[PDB]
Design a protein around this ligand. Structure first.
Ligand SMILES: COC(=O)c1ccc2nc(NC(C)=O)sc2c1
Length: 833
């Protein structure tokens, strides 16, 4: 229909990709997936509470932190309620449901709901107020809980549109006819590898022929694998060699319909590990890319129990030898009693053997131990990586994810969305899981949209698959969100244009012009006049709605990339703050890497949360919105650590100790408040000391480090260092705020938090190892070597004794004392040659 044809154009503009495009496919896999996803989409729309979906209560069932329980002069805590300048503070119990406070209103002074002042965050549902995320945020910040007596938002605004083995198999060895290669404009050979979970089952090469625009072979490449032995999820990896790899392409030997791939194929190749090297998608640039023409016509002993128990224990990056694999496979029923052995056991399977594969499925039936076990995110995710191409293995991991509460989904989301790059087929248990969790909760859904949209907008390798998952979501989120994302995209597209034009205007030559700041205000006034939405939603903080720009407050930052500095008025008039919303728009670096580091930082804070530690990290908002471009959060009242040095000193290099504490006393209204800033610095520094070290992003210029007037420290621009000696940034100016020029009471405390922190991350070695190895593979293609991945092993000191490693970190701190300003001076010198 005419109104159905227009709905798809609204989807296309939102997605950033035309999903109804068949000009780059050799099968109907994406269409089979659009169609396949219709049922889990309609099933989650129909299953969700309309009243609770509309209000998206953000809650946790995690035990209330020990540090935060102490914040209350226990048992009865007070919160402020508003309703037309009628504001009364009410003492409420932490175990009180919102309704208990709602019916306490009739007694104090239903048809109305408790909403937070300034943001779209309702305190609703049958949950104790201690379990609401906003309340916990306010407690820790030393901030007053302010709510307004709003009315419940209409679930009718969330209105949804109505509309929607293998048998070619025989004993014969598998063969593929390589006809030749063609590019529009040494010697060249083609490599044919049968891959399953990165493990090469069989490898065959061609006779090298002279390098020409049309190379022909007409050769049949018979493999050692029988047609019957081919496992579903296996890839035919075609690679072109000089000995250097030039081009590569993949083709899924078994269909999404379980059919062996028979026929003539002209595959457009990708030009030169990386997750992009795994893609089933062909190159869209059919005009410039090389193509490949192909044809397809077809009781246990103690000494040994000690050995596999030692294997079970070794980290996710320790390789298994044939000895280990054979042992694991033979004593597989024992290995099944230990859930932390499943990644090792499933990597001991001979996937190129139907017999072994069937036995693995027989072994999978007796999942009793696996299912009854407590969900290990580090173990679950380990089975979703590149080493696992089996659908049934991947599903048992996706099964454990079904038990994550919306709080923990939102937490591992980016990495679960990235884990989709490891799936053999477009339709998968994981893709579906992500769809259900998103369609169910607006916060999971809002983030899902941008997370998918970032990859769609800058990867020709996975945009097709990701675009399909997005259309499926967009069709079930509702008209409210469908309108809400529309105004978010309109604002981003306009601003991104402004960002690139102003980057072009500025020379790149160190300093910024008066006419550049004038042209910005002039271009912002043209956007503000008309076309730009009256109000929109902040993509990194969906709670906050941004109204109209503060054109006078907007400027162009004095950096080599020339980013935008934008201030926005809050759309809410209940904003009990004057404060504008500050967003930085920047073209230059891949903010997909900042996004990743920022997410692990959020994980480390949660790891510390369980050990009752708050290390005051500041993982600010950041969304990659397109090719080498995106938006960033402005952390209010913060300044560059180098800019504080550049103030007193005025120029590069001298660097005085006291300067830091000088600015701290300068920017603290009371010495009684300065004592709290000293306290906030001592562990906000400790947090970033540990974190950056573990992730190997500790060697950074003091320009890339910031501090608030309240003394909270934070590292910035992570993609800058990732697009390329000391352990971390601990400098004499920081050591001066502690009282060390030697030991002091604060520096003693710094090390104590550092040791308690480095050891707390170590109790989660395997989680951090998979998150890191996955992050490098799916996000940063520069650092995708065996050696780059293995950094987290040495950093976390795997296998080392708890006391022996506690010394390794205290020794690392001493390398900072050894080298006071040695490389901070070298960095300052380097960034000016
Ligand atoms: C590339 O810059 C960043 O990543 C970044 C992150 C946070 C941040 N917060 C800032 N705050 C202020 C007040 O300058 S500037 C800034 C910059």
């Amino acid at each position: 229909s005419e109104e159905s044809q227009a709905f798809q154009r609204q989807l296309t503009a939102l997605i950033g990709y035309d999903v109804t495009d068949v000009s780059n496919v050799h099968d109907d896999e994406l269409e089979f997936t659009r169609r396949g996803l219709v049922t889990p989409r309609m099933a989650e729309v129909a299953s969700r509470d309309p009243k609770l979906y509309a209000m998206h209560p953000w809650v946790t069932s995690k035990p209330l932190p020990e540090y935060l329980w102490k914040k209350i002069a226990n048992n009865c805590i007070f919160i402020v309620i508003h309703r037309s300048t009628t504001s009364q503070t009410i003492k409420v119990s932490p175990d009180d449901t919102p309704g208990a406070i709602l019916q306490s209103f009739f007694t104090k002074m239903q048809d109305f709901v408790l909403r937070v002042c300034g943001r779209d965050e309702y305190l609703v549902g049958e949950t104790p107020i201690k379990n609401f995320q906003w309340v916990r945020h306010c407690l820790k910040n030393g901030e007053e809980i302010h709510v307004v007596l709003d009315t419940p938002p209409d679930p009718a605004l969330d209105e949804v549109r109505k509309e929607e083995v293998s048998l070619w198999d025989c004993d014969r060895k598998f063969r593929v006819k390589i006809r030749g290669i063609d590019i529009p404009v040494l010697t060249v050979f083609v490599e044919a590898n049968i891959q399953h979970g990165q493990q090469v089952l069989c490898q065959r090469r061609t006779s090298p022929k002279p390098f020409t625009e049309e190379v022909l072979w007409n050769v049949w490449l018979e493999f050692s694998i029988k047609i019957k032995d081919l496992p579903k999820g296996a890839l035919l990896n075609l690679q072109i060699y000089c000995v250097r790899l030039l081009y590569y392409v993949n083709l899924l030997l078994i269909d999404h319909r379980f059919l062996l791939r028979r026929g003539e194929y002209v595959l457009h190749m990708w030009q030169i590990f990386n997750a992009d090297k795994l893609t089933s998608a062909t190159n869209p640039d059919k005009e410039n890319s090389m193509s490949i023409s192909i044809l397809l016509d077809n009781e246990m002993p103690n000494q040994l129990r000690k050995q596999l128990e030692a294997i079970i224990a070794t980290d996710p990056l320790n390789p298994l030898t044939a000895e280990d694999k054979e042992l694991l496979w033979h004593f597989r029923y024992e290995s099944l009693k230990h859930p932390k052995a499943y990644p090792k056991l499933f990597s001991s399977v001979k996937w190129g053997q139907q017999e072994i594969v069937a036995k693995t499925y027989q072994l999978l039936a007796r999942r009793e131990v696996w299912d009854q076990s407590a969900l290990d995110v580090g173990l679950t995710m380990q089975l979703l990586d590149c080493n696992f191409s089996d659908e049934n293995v991947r599903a048992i991991a996706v099964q454990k994810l079904e038990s994550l509460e919306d709080d923990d989904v939102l937490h591992y989301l980016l990495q679960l969305v990235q884990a989709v790059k490891f799936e053999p087929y477009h339709d998968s248990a994981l893709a579906r899981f992500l769809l259900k969790r998103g369609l169910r909760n607006k916060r999971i859904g809002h983030f899902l949209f941008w997370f998918l949209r970032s990859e769609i907008a800058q990867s020709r390798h996975y945009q097709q698959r990701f675009a399909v998952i997005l259309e499926a979501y967009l069709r079930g989120c509702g008209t409210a969100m469908l309108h809400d994302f529309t105004q978010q995209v309109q604002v981003i597209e306009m601003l991104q244009k402004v960002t690139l034009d102003i980057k072009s205007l500025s020379a790149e030559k160190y300093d910024v012009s008066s006419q550049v700041i004038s042209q910005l205000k002039q271009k912002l006034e043209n956007l503000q006049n008309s076309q730009l939405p009256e109000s929109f939603r902040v993509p990194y903080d969906p709670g906050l709605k941004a109204g109209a720009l503060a054109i006078e407050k907007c400027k162009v930052m004095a950096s080599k990339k020339k980013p935008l500095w934008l201030e926005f008025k809050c759309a809410d008039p209940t904003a009990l703050s004057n404060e504008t919303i500050g967003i930085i728009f920047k073209h230059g670096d891949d903010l997909r890497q900042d996004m990743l580091i920022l997410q692990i930082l959020r994980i480390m804070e949660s790891i510390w949360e369980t050990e009752s530690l708050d290390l005051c990290l500041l993982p600010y908002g950041c969304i990659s919105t397109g090719d080498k471009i995106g938006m960033i959060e402005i952390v209010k009242d913060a300044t560059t650590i180098a800019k504080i040095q550049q103030s007193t000193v005025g120029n590069t290099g001298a660097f005085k100790d006291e300067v830091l504490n000088h600015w701290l006393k300068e920017k603290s209204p009371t010495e009684e408040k300065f004592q709290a800033a000293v306290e906030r610095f001592v562990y906000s520094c400790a947090g970033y000391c540990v974190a950056t070290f573990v992730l190997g992003i500790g060697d950074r210029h003091n320009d890339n480090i910031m501090i608030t007037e309240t003394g909270n420290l934070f590292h910035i621009d992570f993609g800058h260092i990732l697009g390329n000696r000391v352990p971390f940034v601990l400098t004499p100016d920081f050591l001066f705020v502690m009282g060390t020029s030697k030991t002091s009471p604060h520096f003693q405390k710094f090390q104590d938090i550092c040791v308690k922190a480095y050891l707390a991350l170590r109790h989660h070695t395997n989680l951090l190892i998979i998150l890191f190895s996955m992050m490098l593979m799916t996000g940063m293609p520069q650092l995708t070597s065996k050696e780059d991945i293995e950094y987290i092993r040495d950093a976390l000191t795997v296998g080392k004794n708890e006391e022996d490693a506690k010394k390794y970190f205290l020794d690392q701190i001493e390398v900072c004392r050894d080298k006071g300003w040695t490389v901070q001076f070298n960095w300052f010198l380097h960034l000016v040659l």
